Amino acid sequence: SNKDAALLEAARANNMQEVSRLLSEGADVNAKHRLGWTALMVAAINRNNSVVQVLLAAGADPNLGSFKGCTALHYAVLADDYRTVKELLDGGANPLQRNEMGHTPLDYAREGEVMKLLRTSEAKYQEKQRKREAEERRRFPLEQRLKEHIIGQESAIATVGAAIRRKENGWYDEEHPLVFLFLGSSGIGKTELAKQTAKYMHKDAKKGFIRLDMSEFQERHEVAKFIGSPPGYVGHEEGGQLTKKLKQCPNAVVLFDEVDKAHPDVLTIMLQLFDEGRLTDGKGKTIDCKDAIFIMTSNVASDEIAQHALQLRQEALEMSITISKNFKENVIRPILKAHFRRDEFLGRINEIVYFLPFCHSELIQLVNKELNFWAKRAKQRHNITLLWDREVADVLVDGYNVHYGARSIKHEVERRVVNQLAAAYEQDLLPGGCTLRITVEDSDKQLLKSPELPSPQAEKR
Amino acid sequence: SNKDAALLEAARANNMQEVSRLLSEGADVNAKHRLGWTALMVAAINRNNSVVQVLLAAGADPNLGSFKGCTALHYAVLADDYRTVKELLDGGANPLQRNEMGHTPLDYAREGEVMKLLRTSEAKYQEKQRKREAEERRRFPLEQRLKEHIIGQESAIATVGAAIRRKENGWYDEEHPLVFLFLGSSGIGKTELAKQTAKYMHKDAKKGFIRLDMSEFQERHEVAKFIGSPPGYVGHEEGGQLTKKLKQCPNAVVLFDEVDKAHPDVLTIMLQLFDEGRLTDGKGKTIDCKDAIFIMTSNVASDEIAQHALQLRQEALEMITISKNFKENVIRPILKAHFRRDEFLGRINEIVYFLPFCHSELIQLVNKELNFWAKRAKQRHNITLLWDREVADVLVDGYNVHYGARSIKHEVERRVVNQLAAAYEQDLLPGGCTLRITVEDSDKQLLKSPELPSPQAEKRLPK
Amino acid sequence: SNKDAALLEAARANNMQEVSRLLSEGADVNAKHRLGWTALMVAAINRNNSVVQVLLAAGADPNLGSFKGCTALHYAVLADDYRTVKELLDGGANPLQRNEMGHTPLDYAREGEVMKLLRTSEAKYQEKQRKREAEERRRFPLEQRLKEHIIGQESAIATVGAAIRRKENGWYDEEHPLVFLFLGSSGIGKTELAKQTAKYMHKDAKKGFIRLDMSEFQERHEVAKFIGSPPGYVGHEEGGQLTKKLKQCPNAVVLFDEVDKAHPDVLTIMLQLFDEGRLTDGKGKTIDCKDAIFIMTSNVASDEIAQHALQLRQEALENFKENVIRPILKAHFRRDEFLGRINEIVYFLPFCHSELIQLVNKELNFWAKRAKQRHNITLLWDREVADVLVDGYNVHYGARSIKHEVERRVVNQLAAAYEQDLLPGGCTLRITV
Ligand SMILES: Nc1ncnc2c1ncn2[C@@H]1O[C@H](COP(=O)(O)OP(=O)(O)OP(O)(O)=S)[C@@H](O)[C@H]1O
Ligand SMILES: Nc1ncnc2c1ncn2[C@@H]1O[C@H](COP(=O)(O)OP(=O)(O)OP(O)(O)=S)[C@@H](O)[C@H]1O
Ligand SMILES: [Mg+2]
Ligand SMILES: [Mg+2]
What is the SS3 assignment for A259? Predict the structure, then answer.
């Protein structure tokens, strides 16, 4: 309490030393005096440009509120201090924010540099969105980014990108949120594609990617987690995780991993959310999520999809490829109808994305990706150069298992190669060119920059 | 708040007695003065070695952040007091600790005792790192540690040791936990190996080893134990149990003993845990246990594994523990069809197979049990216990394959320890008690006194 | 209570300043004195015309209920002040509302302008009622009403209209609930006809519509949703899905979206819906369904119409009513109870080429106008594009197939062109395939 009053007085008195010391020592930057003025506003009204600058550096809010409701920008423009107004605008001050009396800083601003600064800030705010729109669609389509992380699944990537672009440009039913369903065998990038899409939509914003694993919603009462308990009940003050996260980021990508595990009541709530487009928490607040993107992953028809894709590959080899026809989708549909038992739920789904089991070339690409990851990790951590040959890739892919997808290749690479590297690391490995070779059927290693097979550090003795 | 001010004033005055009294009363050891100095900081700047000693004894933190963001070590070094700097370093102060401006205590030190002491502490940190690395280079007994407690199962030991070594030396993806599944007959060391691995990884730390008896999760709704109840239901405030335990020790060894007893819908929750090591409790908090180790024990393919091992050993007897495609053709359809989904098995890094003991391994088990009992007798009653090879043969004759080492354990308890406990009624004294086979070869065995020429008496129960 | 007392005293004394201050401070405009009279009532009896005006502007209700139970209109009329009565009526006061003693304001009114004003308000109410009746009469022919927003299904529309007229005109068993079973494939206007029927019959917004998916109703969900989990059961969702909405609109149009997927228990409880209705709610309330409209639907009989196409081809286009009496339905749904009580069965026919192309055209028109930069919309070859689209004929699950055809062959192309910045304005279509 004393520190806050001292900071307020220092801001009023334009005391650079006191303000800096209090801010560095943990004093609340936005401490509010009983008269309604914080350090930033008292600094702005008194033309304390240095105090305003230091407060902004510490995290002061220039948009935080007769001058009732006047923010720091309002007082800075009132004081006719162009430097203070510019500094506050640099901190995110809104030149059109209205105080309790409805007066914006522009209205309080006197003709001169203050008005120009406010107009420039408003123009920058307006044109930032245009710049983002121009940059997003150019030189970096979603498909381009996805192809970096995902191997194969070209049709799925194209479908997702086309749908996303349609939503972005408005050539779509903007009255309803965009909904996807991902199907296929295991270990083929459903969750991976969803995560990459979320990252691309929201860059690095964690709040932009709401992750829900439906395996926790196998019971009827689990729906409470979406919206929280009703008033007066245990934990009602937390109105569900989903509602809070959505209101934090309306256009967040929502992933319901393994949706098939969810209890039917949960699916009913999901369908209500999709059709309505907004959800009401347990506190009576309703949150609009029309622009949100919902992605669902499951393996309900995985076996049918996989065996049909393998049959189509074999049929194409009789011509010597895999484009699954809509009739196979009609054949699959009854399975989905039986599992979900909600014909409206399936109909509400905007897109069904099918992932195919990998072909041999895609397995080779997967093995190469894993080896590259391990090689770069070794180079970074221990300055070890790792090399391999096509034969090594063939040998590793020989361990592939269709029922597990990329996970099988990952585990095979780890056990066959990485185990040897770890065993030899403590004593033999050093910076240089370590190359993997095949003797007859097993993977062997070569000495750094020399064709000498390292002696394995036989455990025990 | 007056207690904090009094403690700060006492510390700045080099008053050990007042500082101790304030600390005992309940004054915060890390109380911060309005000028940024804490009690330890003001003690250090004034060369108050006794004050620093008493503050550290109460739990003072010398690494807490122009003197902006400085540390008690910085102030002690600035005053150039060897004793105060030494005490602060002994209390956890780091000469590599950096203040707001980035200055380290080494920088503040002037040539003399303080500079040498700070260099010594920096070398202590660096050599701690290097010596941990050197030990890890030497730390290759995990196979030895296991073989101390486990007999046979060489393939399982090798697999687990290789995976653990890989994880320990880096060389492992941090985006996915490490998962094992242990398969085989009953009483062959699955749970034993899991417990030994947990002990090795976390020494004696109880929080480091998390145990779950999946036989208690035979119902779909029982999954709530992992994550707790949702908001508005009994026990919601408590939250998940497994989530709490994982929060305590993120890198703990998790053991789902007898997992095939669980309802498949309960196993369903393990998909995320095994893939990304993330679980969200009933309150919506993720635990992010990426670097934990998950071990599952089950006997689903017990009969197939045992039969295949017996057949392989019979074949090898013509003139050892390898199965290449037998796993995929035979074991996999069992595991998948009767209990699991494909995606669940896809997340398991390694499947470990335990095979039934060979005859020599049975002899080793019998010797292990006899050694355990002899150790107990010597340690407690100062009784030395001896036996012969024929004793081991007779004991192993009672071995039962369906029960594994438990059969031998019970046999030893039944046919030997019962006689030892009955002889312990004043017929056992601290001498070389010897166990021998009677004239009836492979039929009976008796105890002999400290002096071997005398057999132990009838135990005279029907008094 | 202090604010209410102050407002009441100010209204009684005609203190405009005090009334305004109390209203601006949040005092209840409809504050009720312990003796039964409110601020508006006392202002009215005292001829405080300005106080009544300001109270009404603040939201005062002049219909709030020996003068016990008298409304503000009653008190203004008793005071014989024309201005106060006019102001109260302007706010919605009813000149015929009775107090607890059964005395209307007209009875309290004395000869003068008050009589004329109260009778004018009564005439306004009567004219409103007559206007609603005339609008409902003009709603006929309901066949045209439905055809305004539906394509095809003329037979079903005519049947529904005739049944509605018969029930309205007393030529039906009005004592018994009214129930249709709708038969055919999915997505052929069943839900569209039910929704249009609800929109037209009920005044607006389909407030009286009630549609449910009987596929989610099972032994574990029958009472918890259909009747709604009553008190003392696992869950407290009384009403659940059906009777929670029937509490407001007893004459609801109620759609059950697949009886092939309905549970035997729910199909049995649905037996209450017939005879007299009065279906038990989770709260225990029962609704007389003799006036309600139930629309069961199924696809189990979807073949009976599609396989023939005679009911469509031979219905005066260029078969017979109940060509086979309940062919599959009796064996499946126990005609003795469930279908024996159904008053009528409505067939739904596969969409014709003309109907399909009309749907395509309407969807394309929507998309054209849906365009934000409509200047770029030319719709050149729209008829030909529709001809191409209908090639993917709806023979699978309903008009949603045609909607997906339109989305695939049109929307994607336009989005791609927009992304390629090839749409400045005056843009034609493209004939693919
Ligand atoms: N198409 C892919 N390209 C590159 N890596 C992939 C691909 N698919 C999977 N992976 C990797 O292998 C791992 C497998 O996990 P997922 O892709 O998310 O499983 P899935 O394909 O969705 O099938 P389920 O859900 O287990 S039945 C991922 O974490 C990826 O790192
Ligand atoms: N040296 C050893 N080698 C193998 N097993 C041992 C050894 N020493 C002790 N055990 C026994 O191993 C048993 C635990 O192993 P488990 O394989 O989990 O048996 P289990 O619990 O019956 O297995 P299942 O899965 O339930 S069939 C305990 O009875 C231990 O006493
Ligand atoms: Mg996944
Ligand atoms: Mg066990």
Answer: helix
Q: Retrieve residue C29's tokens.
A: 């405009």
Residue C8 included in any domain:
no
Bond preceding residue C141 cis, omega within 30 of 0: yes
B301 and B412 in one domain? no
Breaks in chain A follow which residues, C to N over 2.5 Å? 65, 320
Q: Does A225 touch chain C (CB under 8 A)?
A: no
Mutate which of A218, A343, A345 to test chain C, going by most C C-beta atoms within 10 A? A343
Whether C293 contacts C269, CB under 8 Å? no
User: In C310-355, which ranges are E strands?
Assistant: 344-347
**Six-digit token string for A231:** 């008033």
User: Which of A357, A384, A417 is a domain's end point?
Assistant: A357
* Residue B351, strand partner residues: B181
Q: Is C213 on the interface with A (CB under 8 A)?
A: yes
Same-domain status, B268 and B365? no
Q: Out of C331, C350, C369, pick the residue that ends a domain.
A: C350
Q: Is B1 domain-assigned?
A: no
CA of A404 relative to ligand 1 center, distance in Å: 9
Q: Which two tokens stand for residue C227?
A: 């009747």
Closest CA–CA distance from residue C218 to any residue of chain A (Å): 11
Q: At what angle do helices A49-58 and A2-12 cross, to 10 degrees?
A: 140
Contacts of B36 in chain A (CB under 8 A): 21, 24-25
CA C222 to CA C217: how far, in whole Å? 5
Percentages helix, strand, coil for chain B, rounded to the nearest 5?
A: 50, 10, 40
Q: Are residues C315 and C334 in the same domain?
A: yes
From the list B171, B282, B349, the residue facing A422 with the nearest CB is B171
Same domain for C172 and C220? Answer: yes
Residues with their C more than 2.5 Å from the N of the next written residue in chain B, i.e. before a break, are 65, 319
Q: Tell me which amino acid residue B391 is.
A: V
Neighbours of C134 (CB within 10 A): 10
CA C295 to chain centre: 15
Q: Residues B83, B88, B92, B94: is their CA dihedral positive or negative?
A: negative
> Which residue is listed with tokens 């249709």?
C180
Q: Is residue C139 located within the same domain as residue C287? A: yes
Residues in chain C: 433
- The angstrom resolution of this structure is 2.9
Q: Are residues C153 and C279 in the same domain?
A: yes
**Residue range(s) defining the domain that contains residue A343:** 130-357
Q: How was this structure determined?
A: cryo-EM
Q: Give buried/exposed letters for B309-344 (b at 16+ CB in 10 A, else e).
A: beebeeeeeeeeeebeebbeebbbebbeeebbbbbb
Domain check: are C147 and C283 in the same one?
Answer: yes
The answer to whether position A10 is within a domain reads no
Please give the Cα distance from B138 to B126 (Å, whole number).
18
The backbone torsions φ and ψ at residue C139, rounded to the nearest 5 degrees and listed phi first, read: -55, -35
Q: How many CA atoms lie within 13 A of B75 on its CB side?
A: 27
At B191, list the tokens: 């749970």
* The token pair that represents C293 in the structure block: 């409209």
Quote the ligand 1 centre to A162 CA distance (angstroms).
Answer: 22
Which residue's structure tokens are 């609603």?
A: C132
Backbone angles phi, psi at A302, to 5 degrees: -60, -45
**Residue C202 belongs to some domain of the structure:** yes
User: Which residues in chain C are followed by a discontinuity, with C-to-N distance exceeding 2.5 angstroms?
Assistant: 65, 318
CB atoms within 10 A of CB B263: 15
A166 CB neighbours in chain C (<8 A) are 411-412, 415
- Any chains having at least 3 CB pairs less than 8 A from chain C are A
**Alpha-carbon distance values, A385 to A366, A433, C95 (Å):** 20, 5, 96
Q: How many domains does chain B have?
A: 2
CA dist A392 and A442 (Å) reads 9
Q: Token pair of B40, please?
A: 């330890």
Please tell me whether residues A298 and A367 are part of one structural domain.
no
